[PDB]
Subunit: 478 residues, 4 copies
C-alpha cells in the first residue's frame, strides 16, 4: 500500500466475524502491523484511546452506482461525494457497476469507469461489469477482463426487455462461460416480459403515479426470475448472486436453494433492510418518486423485519446499498408517467447503522455476524479475504471504532448525498461509527470527514475464490 | 342419449365421491332412471347381481393420444383399439389432444380429429385443442371452437423450442384470452430452451442411449416451467392446468400455489403414479426406449409413492394416462440418438388399478376419493358434472362394478394395446373392474369386451365451469 | 315428526358439489321433492326465493351453552343461544359436555341432554369432554358410543392440575377412541408452559388482558398440536384440533394432511373474523371480552390466512366456540387476567364472517362455503347427507341466503345476552333472509319464530366413512 | 531432552475461514510460528507435509468411554477409546458424566475426572447429564459451572422412570442454565410414547432388534425436538440437540434457526454414515450392534440428507456418541430388544465418513469440513481459538490429512475392543496420515505413539460469545 503515518489504537474491543477480543492495534503504511498487548512501538506514535468501544473491519458496500449514466443524465453522487457518504457511515470499500451501452465495448466502459473512480474515489474500490448484451466478442471481453483487469463479477439482466434483457439460451451460455472462468454470475432478477405488459395495463387504467411502479412489479415477478436464474445456474454448475433482494418470496427461494446445496448468494440492500414500500402511495409525489427503484420496496410491511432475519440466519450473506441517487428535478421527468421516473435511491451512508439497529439491537444477530454481513462475507465471495473484512496482521488498515450505544436521526439535512430526499428520513437508528480509518488514515473523527479526492485505489479481484468455487470444482470432478 | 335396453343392477355398494350406500340401479336409453330399493320395474328386464361389490362411476381419462400423428408416423393404438383398452381398465370416457401442425388451422385439425374419433371410439369422448402456434387468426379460431364446437380446454407448450414453444409474452396473451373466454389453460411445462442445450451437451459426451433422454430433462426444468406458468396464470387471473405431472418438485409447486389461493390443477398420469425412471438405464435398449416420454419418469424412486400421496391429499386432483404408444420398430428409429426416440408410453388400461393399488390399498385415500380422482374431479373441472362422474338419477349410465379384492398381473401378452411393451410389465395390482357399463350397454363382462366401433359420442364441453371459474369471476370484481 | 307442508320456489340451490335452479317441496321434517313444476297439494304455503341462494343450514360444531363455570353459568343458555344460531343461519349445534374431574361422563351427558332437550330451538348433538382418565372412564366412553349417540370426545393438553392429561394418557385415549370409531378432539395448548408464563407475566405486573394473550403465545398452541398429531399418528387415531387460532397451528395441520395423516382443523368465528390487537384496548371491559383460549393472535395477518386455508381445504369446517359471559362475570378478573373467564361470542356471526372474509374476497366459491359451514361437519360427524345437503330424503334445514345483503354487527342487535360483541361495528357482506329448521320457518323478515325445546338430539354413529375408511385400511396392512 | 519442538514444512494449512501454504513451528504444546523460511533452532525434528492438508485436530463432542451400564461398562475405556479417536484424526473428546438418579452430580464429575485424567491419551472435557432435578442438583449445577470448568448439561426426554424430566422441569432447568451461561443439551425422544410402543411390540412377539427401531420411529424424535425447541425459546435458553438421527428432526432444527432461535444440531458418525436397514439383518449380533437411541433411520435417503444439512450449516458439528459394548453384553437382549444395551462405535470413523460423504461428493468444501469437525465445536463450547484453529498461540493439535487416501473400515483393524463395526466393509475417501496432539506425534506411518493419562482436562467457561451474545441482547429488550 501507500504511505501513512504510524498509528496505534489502544483499549479496543476487536470484533472480527469469528470472535471478539481485547488487544491493541499498531498500523503503518496502509497495513496492520501488530495486534496484542504491551506492543513495542516507536516513541511519539499517534495514539487513539478506544476506551472499550468496538473496533471492526470497515464496511464493504458491494453494490454502488456512482455518477452512473442514465438516459442522458448522471446520478448526483459521484465517486468523490458518494464515497464521502460511504465513509461517513463506516464503509471503507465500494464495488460499483460498470454499465456499457448495448452494442458497446465492455472493456472501454471498464476503462472509463476506472478513470472516473481512480481520480475521485476517497476509498478503495473494485468493479462489477454488467453484461448488457451478449455475442462472441463480448465473451472474448469477459475473458480478458477476468485475466488482465481484476474483474471477477459480472451481472446479467432478466428485466428491461428490449434494452438489456437476455434470453434463457443466453443465460445458459453466460453462466456456462462465467463458471468455467471462475467468475461470480450476478443477476438483476425480475421478469421483464411480464413487467412490460403490467406497465401497459397500469397506464391504461390511468395509474400514472409512482404507485404504478410497485404495482407493475409485484414480488411474484422477482421470485419467478430468481427461481429461473437459480435453475439455470444449477444446470450449468455456475455460482449465482442475486442482487437487490427486496421481497420475502425471493429470499425464500435463495434460502431453499442453499439448503439443497446450490451455490447461491443473496444481496439485500439498505432499502429492503430498512423500510417498506407503503410510501409509493405518498400524497407528496416527489417523496414517492424518491423510493422508485427496481425491484421495488415491498408494500408488505412485514418485509424488512424478515429480510433482517434471513441475513441474521445466513440465508442472506451480505449487504449492499445499490446507491443510485437522482435529483428532485431528474425524478420529475416521470411526473405523469411512472415508467419515465429514473430508478434508484440512497443507502450507502445508512447501511451499517440500519443493520445494527434492525438486526443487532433487536437480538437477531450478534456483533460478529454483523461484521460478516457488512464486510467479511463480501470479502470471501469476491476474493478479498483477508486483506479486507478482517483485523489481523498483514491485512489492510481499514477499520472503524463503532459505538453500539450511539443514536442518530437520519435526515437529508445531514447526509453527505447531493439528493434532496432521503428514504430513511426521520428514522432513529441505534449504532454509529465514531472513528473511521481507511488506508491507515483517520478519515472520520468527531463528526468530521478528512478525505483526499482520488486517494482510493482500485483493488483487483481474482477469479476462483475458494469460498465460492471449491464446491463447484468438486461437483465438476464427478 | 341413444337407445339401450333396460338394465337393472341389484345388490351393489354405490360409491360416489361424496358417500357410499346400498341401492339398486335401473337404467334405460343411456340414462340412470332410478336408484333405490325394491324398485318397481317392468317384467323381463336384464338383471345383474352385484353381490356387495362396488359400483362406481366410469373412469374419465382426461389425457390420451390415440392415432396421433408424429413425425410421419402414427401411434399404434387408434381411437378404436385405444378405447377398448380404456374400457378393459374401467375407463368409460377419454379426452384426447388435437395437435395442429404449426401455422395450420386449429379448426381443420379439430374436424380431422372428430372424423377419426366419431368413426372409431367405443366410448364417449371429448377433445383438448393444442395451441401449437399463436397469432390473431389462431385467437379467432380459439374463440370459435369454444362458441361452436364444444371445446373448453387448450394446451400450450413451454417445451419443444422452434417447434411448439411459446414465449412469455405469448403465454400472457394466451392466458389472458383463455381466462376471458372461460377455458381451461393447460400447459406442457418443461423449459425447452435449456433442454435443447442439455440435449446437445449429452450427445457431445457420447450419451446417445435412452438415459440421455431423462438426463437432459432433469425435474428442475419441469419445476421451473411449472413455476413460471403458475406465475403468469396468476397475473392474468387465468386458471392453470399442469398436464403430466411427473416429479415431486413440480407437484410441490402446485401444492404451494393452491394453498396461496391460486386456481391451479395437476394431472399426474399412470406412469408417474405407477413406476419410476430407473429403467432408462436398462441394458435392454428397447425396454428403456419404451419408457421414453416427456417429461420423463423421475429416476428418484421415492417419486411414485409421493405422487400418490398428493393425489390422495387433493394437492393433485385428477388422473390421466397420456396414452401414446409406439411400436418396437418405431421406437428403434432413435437407436443412435435419444432425441429421435418417439415420445410416449402406455397407461390407459392400467390407470384405475394402479391408483387403487398404490393409493387405496396402501391406505392413503379411501374409495370415495378414488372416485374423485378417477372421474368426478375431471367431470367438475371440464364442465361435465354430474352427467359424468356420478351415479345419480338423470346422469349418463357409465358405470363399473369394481372388485377391490381382485389381483391381476399386468403384461403385454394380455393388454388391449398393440404395443409390444408395457412399462408396468410384471406388476401385481390390487383392484380391477368386473363389469363395465357404457351408454347403458354391457361392454365388459366375465373377461370379455363387447364393443361397437364408432358407438362413442363426442361430448361438447361448455366454458366457465363453476368449480374453476366462480373464484376467478369474484376476483375480477375487486381492485 | 310433524311440520306443515312447505314449498320454496325460484331458488338457486347451492350444495357443496354443485349449484342449480329448482323448486323444493318439504313435509314432516323432510325434503320430499326437488325439481320444476312440482305436483303438490293445493293450499301449500309457498315462499318465493327470487333467484336468491338456498343452502343447507349451518352446522356449528362447537358451542358452550349454559356451561358451568366456577358456580356461574355462561349467559347464553340452550334456548337463547340457539336463537342466536338460527338468527345467523345455523340450524344445528354440537355442544361440549363437561364432566367435573373424578365425575361420571355418562351422568354429565344425561344432565346435558335434559338441559338441551328442554331448551334447544334447533337440532343438536354432543361432544363429551374427557376431563380425567381411568378404567371406568374408558368403560363410559364405550357405552356412550354404543348406546348414547356420541362419536366425538375431547381431551385437554391445557389446564394443568384441572383437566390436562399426560402423554401416556393421550396414547391410551387415542388408542381406545380409534378402536371404537370415535373422533379424538383436542384442546391443544401446552398447559405446563402456560402455567409458568402466567406466573412470569403476573410477576412483571402485567395483570391486564394483554397478559392473557402474552402468556399463551402461539408457539404453545403449535407445540401441543404437533404432539397431538404425533401421538394420534402412532395410535392410528383420527385427530380433530378444536379452536384453531394461529397460523403456525394451521400450518402443522396442513403439513400433517399432506403426509396423509387423518387430521382436521376447526377454526372458529373469532380467528376467522378478527385479530388479537384488542387485548391492548384501554377499555378494560372490551379487552376482557376477547379473552378466550387459545387466544386471538396479535399478528394481524392471521385472520386472512385462516380464511385462506379454510378456502384451500387445509382447514375443513367452522365452529364458534360460543361461550359468553356477562360484563360483571368478566370483571372478576380485573386485577388478574387469570381469573377472567374464558370465552367469546360467535354463533350468530359465523356464516356472515366466512362469507364476507372468504367468498366476497374470492378465496372460495359458494359451494366450498357450504362445505365449510355444513357439509364437511356433516361428513366428519357421520351426519351426511341427513344434514349438510339439500336433496330428497334429507332433513329440511335450509337457509335462503342473500349474498348481496350488508349488515353491521352490534351488541344492540344480537340475540346474545352478552353486553359486548367482539365483532362490534364490523360491516359484513352476506346474510340469511329466511331460515327453515325441521321444515318450519324460524326466521323471516327479521323476526324469529321459535319454540323452546323443539330441537331434537341427533345421535351420531361411530366409524364415519370420511374419517375411518383410511384408518381401517391402514389397520389391515402389514 | 526437556522439550518437544517440531516443525512441519510444505503443508497446505486449512482452517475454517481460509486455506494457505505456510510452515508451522511448535514448542511445548503451542503453535509458535506460522509462515515461510522460519528462523528455527538447529536439529529440530522436521516433518515434510508435501502439499498435503494440515487441519486442526478433530473435536468429538460426544463420547461415552467406560460408561456404567447396569453393573457393566462399555468396552472402550478412556485409554483405548482415545487411541481410537487419535487413529481417526480426533485430538479432543467431550464425554458425558452420568450420575445415577438421586446421586450427586459433583461426585459423579469427580469420578469421571479421575478415570479420564489417568487414562485419556488426549485432551478432553465433560458434559454433565442432569439425570434428576431438585434444589440441591440446581446448587450443584451452579458450582460445576463456577468452579469445575463445566458449561454443558444434558437433560433427557426419553427414559421414562429412569431419567426423563417433565415439561415443568425442562422449563426450570432451561431457565437456570440460561441464566448461568451454560449450553442446554437434550436427548430428545418422547419416552412416554416409546415406553408404550415397546410394550406393544413385545406383545405382538417382535423381540428382535427390529423392535428397537420400530418402537422409536423418527416421529417421536421430532416431537421431542420441537417441544424442547419450544421450551428453550420461551426460556431464552440456547438448545443443543444431541445425536440428530432423522431428516424430520434436522428439519425442525433448520426451521427454528431460520426463525432466529439459538439451536444447534449434533449429527453423529452413525446418522452421517449409514442407515437403519440392518436392524432387520438375519445375523442377530449384527443387528444388535446397530442398536442405539435414537435409532438409525430405516429411510435410506437419511444419511445423504444429514450430510447435506451439515454442509449447509443447518447442522453445525459432529460427534460419534461412541458407546461400545461386547458381543456378549449385546446378547443379553437376545430374547428382548429392550434389554439390548444401547450404543455403537463411531469415534475413529467420524472424520473419514464426513470427508467421504460430504467433501468428496461436493456438498461442502475442505474449510467447512474443518468447521464441522472442530471449529464450530470449539466456538460453541468456548474453546476457540485455543482449539479448532491453526494459528500462533493456539494449542498444537493438528492433523496431516490425505484427501486422496482410501481405506476400508473393518473391525479387524479398528482400535475398538468391540467385535463389530457398524461401518464394516465401507470404503472411505479421506484419512489422516499424521496426528499431532500436545505437540507430540501420536500417529505416523500407521503407528500410534501414546502415553496413558497424558491427556489434560480442559475447563470450559460459560457464556461463550457465539452462543450467548444473541441471548443477552434478547434479555435486554
Ligand atoms: Cl423491466
Ligand atoms: Cl423440449
Ligand atoms: Cl392452561
Ligand atoms: Cl426410552
Ligand atoms: Mg486514485
Ligand atoms: Mg360415433
Ligand atoms: Mg326436545
Ligand atoms: Mg374461544
Ligand atoms: Mg491426564
Amino acid at each position: 500500500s501507500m504511505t501513512s503515518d504510524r498509528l496505534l489504537i489502544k483499549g479496543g474491543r476487536i470484533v472480527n466475524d469469528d470472535q471478539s477480543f481485547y488487544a491493541d492495534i499498531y498500523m503503518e503504511d496502509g497495513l496492520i502491523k501488530q495486534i496484542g498487548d504491551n506492543l513495542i512501538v516507536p516513541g511519539g506514535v499517534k495514539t487513539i484511546e478506544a476506551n472499550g468501544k468496538m473496533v471492526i473491519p470497515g464496511g464493504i458496500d458491494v453494490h454502488t452506482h456512482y455518477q452512473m449514466p442514465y438516459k442522458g443524465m448522471t446520478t448526483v453522487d459521484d465517486f468523490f461525494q458518494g464515497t464521502k457518504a460511504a465513509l461517513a457511515g463506516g464503509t471503507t470499500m465500494i464495488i460499483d457497476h460498470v454499465v456499457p451501452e448495448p452494442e458497446s465495448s465492455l472493456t472501454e466502459a471498464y476503462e472509463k469507469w476506472r478513470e472516473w473512480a481512480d481520480g475521485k474515489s476517497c476509498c478503495d474500490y473494485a468493479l462489477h461489469v454488467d453484461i448488457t448484451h451478449w455475442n462472441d466478442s463480448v465473451k472474448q471481453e469477459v475473458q480478458n477482463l477476468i485475466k488482465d483487469k481484476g474483474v471477477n463479477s459480472f451481472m446479467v439482466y432478466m428485466a428491461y426487455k428490449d434494452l438489456y434483457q437476455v434470453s434463457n439460451t443466453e443465460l445458459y451460455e453466460i453462466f456456462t462461460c462465467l463458471g468455467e472462468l471462475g467468475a461470480i454470475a450476478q443477476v438483476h432478477a425480475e421478469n421483464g416480459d411480464i413487467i412490460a405488459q403490467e406497465q401497459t395495463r397500469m397506464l391504461e387504467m390511468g395509474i400514472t403515479g409512482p404507485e404504478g411502479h410497485v404495482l407493475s412489479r409485484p414480488e411474484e415477478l422477482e421470485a419467478e426470475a430468481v427461481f429461473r436464474a437459480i435453475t439455470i445456474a444449477s444446470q450449468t454448475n455456475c455460482p449465482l448472486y442475486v442482487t437487490k433482494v427486496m421481497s420475502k418470496s425471493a429470499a425464500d427461494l435463495i434460502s431453499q436453494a442453499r439448503k439443497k446445496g446450490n451455490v447461491v448468494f443473496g444481496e439485500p440492500i439498505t432499502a429492503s433492510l430498512g423500510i417498506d414500500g407503503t410510501h409509493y402511495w405518498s400524497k407528496n409525489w416527489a417523496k414517492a418518486a424518491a423510493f422508485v427503484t427496481s425491484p421495488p420496496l415491498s408494500p408488505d410491511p412485514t418485509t424488512p423485519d424478515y429480510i433482517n432475519s434471513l441475513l441474521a440466519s445466513g440465508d442472506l450473506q451480505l449487504s449492499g446499498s445499490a446507491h443510485c441517487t437522482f435529483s428532485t428535478a431528474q425524478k420529475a421527468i416521470g411526473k405523469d408517467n411512472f415508467t419515465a421516473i429514473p430508478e434508484g435511491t440512497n443507502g450507502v451512508e445508512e447501511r451499517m447503522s440500519v443493520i445494527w439497529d434492525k438486526a443487532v439491537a433487536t437480538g437477531k444477530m450478534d456483533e460478529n455476524q454483523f461484521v460478516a454481513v457488512t464486510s467479511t462475507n463480501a470479502a470471501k465471495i469476491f476474493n478479498l479475504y483477508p486483506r479486507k473484512g478482517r483485523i489481523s496482521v498483514g491485512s489492510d488498515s481499514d477499520l472503524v471504532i463503532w459505538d453500539p450505544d450511539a443514536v442518530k436521526i437520519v435526515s437529508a439535512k445531514n447526509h453527505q448525498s447531493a439528493a434532496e430526499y432521503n428514504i430513511f428520513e426521520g428514522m432513529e437508528l441505534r449504532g454509529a461509527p465514531l472513528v473511521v480509518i481507511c488506508q491507515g488514515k483517520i478519515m472520520l473523527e468527531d463528526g468530521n470527514l478528512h478525505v483526499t479526492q482520488g486517494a482510493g485505489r482500485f483493488i483487483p479481484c481474482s477469479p476462483f475464490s475458494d469460498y465460492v468455487y471449491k464446491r463447484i470444482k468438486a461437483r465438476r470432478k464427478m
